[PDB]
Amino acid sequence: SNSQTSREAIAKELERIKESIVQLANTSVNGQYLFAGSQVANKPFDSNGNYYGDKNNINVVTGAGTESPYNIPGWDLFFKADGDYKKQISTNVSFTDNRWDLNKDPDKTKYLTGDSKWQQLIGQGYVKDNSLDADKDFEYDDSKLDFPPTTLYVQGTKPDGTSFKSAVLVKPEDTLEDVMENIGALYGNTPNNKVVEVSMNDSGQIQITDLKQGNNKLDFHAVAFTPQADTKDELKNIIEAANQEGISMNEVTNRVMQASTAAPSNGDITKLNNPVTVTINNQQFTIDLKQTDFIKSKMTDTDGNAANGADYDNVYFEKNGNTVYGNVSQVIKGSNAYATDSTKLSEVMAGDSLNGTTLNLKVNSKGGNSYDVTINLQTSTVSYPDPNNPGQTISFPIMHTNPATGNSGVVTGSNDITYGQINDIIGMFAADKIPTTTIQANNGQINNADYTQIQQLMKDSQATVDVSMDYKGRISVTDKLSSGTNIEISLSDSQSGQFPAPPFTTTSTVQNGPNFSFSANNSLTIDEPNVDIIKDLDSMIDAVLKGNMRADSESENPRNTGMQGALERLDHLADHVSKLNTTMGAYHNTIEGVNTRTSF
């Protein structure tokens, strides 16, 4: 009986309890703050704040060279990597049979299972007349038809961390079991050894849980495309149209999609969404195309289009005040903490040299206008052509310091280039009187004065804007000369654009080559080693308020995440704190023994 307002009234006390924890989190012994790291008077938190304390321990010397630590710094609870726990990745979409329509049948709302053969939910999906007979066309096969397949892209992080670009088809009568066997092949979730578990969840979605302890950077996004006839009547025609042509329905699925890209105006390589007219038995027909977003929402892409499902990284940084960040974090190959400036490209890439490695950038600048750039770090090369005359171009190879002298100017080695230079690059997208360059890599040698002048403009640029690698690893930027940022960013890779090997079939096509990730329309999850109060509590409050067991994309919060997700997040947190709880007494009883024998 909890009306919405009822759920807030319940939530209010939790909100009080939330601050109760914040108060507790801010606790001190008369200024000896329990959370300060090593420095007593550090008041560590607020309702909306970060950890405010050192990370050394409060320590006292009693030794021939001995300290004595007796606390825990606040972060080590507040944002601590409780590395035992694993990713909970789920589809925001939910699935059902669709011969019935569930607006016809909202009370019914039956979810897919192994029995749910693929024909059934495409049943009405084939058509606009939406009148197909559930049994006699599909199951009471006295009058059943021929049927074509469906298409799917997939992108995700293999639990080890490797990248892959893949495409695959779905056959007309497929079931859950067909999906699972290919899933085992696709992820290496082998029968001999699994790496993640697959489930259909409490709310009707499809969920996967990771077996890898402390895996923070498991992510997923997928898109499926399908053709659509108009009429139940039209479909039977394609049997005869196709089969007397000598082909089942399945060939027809192939024709429309390729033609769309053949002139991308007919549906681009990635934005494939055009309805098309085609020939079967060289009878003329027109057909509609389906779009499927396994992260679907109230989305308009970075381009400003009503975002087409291919819009994964076609989303900007996520906005919070003067701060914007790519929620798709950059995370350590290990503890899964986050990046540092001097990290060369060598530490990052998958390859001996940055072969064919190249990147693209999108920037809606602080000056309003958008400035988008492409970079081949394989040659340490950055670029920009002139709008009026792109023939003229701006040349810059990446640069560095000397060993002992101002004897300067031979270009960086490709693999060596580091993260700090990235944040430096954002410094260039700063303001108003912005810079430009031109250089020749004379045996790599160049004029440092050009670099030095660039450096000086950068050292003045210090004040403009911030780049940060946050406590979630999210690729973060803050508008310093603002409390609300007039800036937006989006990035992508260009070994993408090159795809798995065609012709694409029901057997998965899988290729490698894209080497980095960016801000994108990522999977949904709240649980992982590292904690964060605001995301964990406030996101889960929203779901209770809306009553959404987990989520709703159309809900103002398109990433409403909680309620059912809270269960194991509680499983995580009970352990997370208990570890911290038992830790302190170990000091206390340890110190007792030392003091006691010292006393004696």
């Binding site: 021939a64 570890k579 170990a586 340890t590 023994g593 024998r597």
Partner: protein, 50 residues
């Protein structure tokens, strides 16, 4: 051994931490507490030497 000297007791409870470690190795603190008891043990060998 007024108070059976720390080393021999460090070992003792350390070995108590062992049977605790058998209780739950997934409870990492069993390691840490176990490790600590030896830490007193070893450093106590070290100080006696000095």
């Amino acid at each position: 051994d007024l108070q059976n000297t720390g080393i021999l007791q460090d070992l003792e409870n350390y070995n108590k931490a062992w049977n605790d470690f058998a209780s739950n190795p997934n409870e990492n603190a069993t390691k840490i507490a176990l490790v600590k008891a030896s830490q007193t043990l070893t450093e106590s060998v070290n100080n006696t030497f000095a």
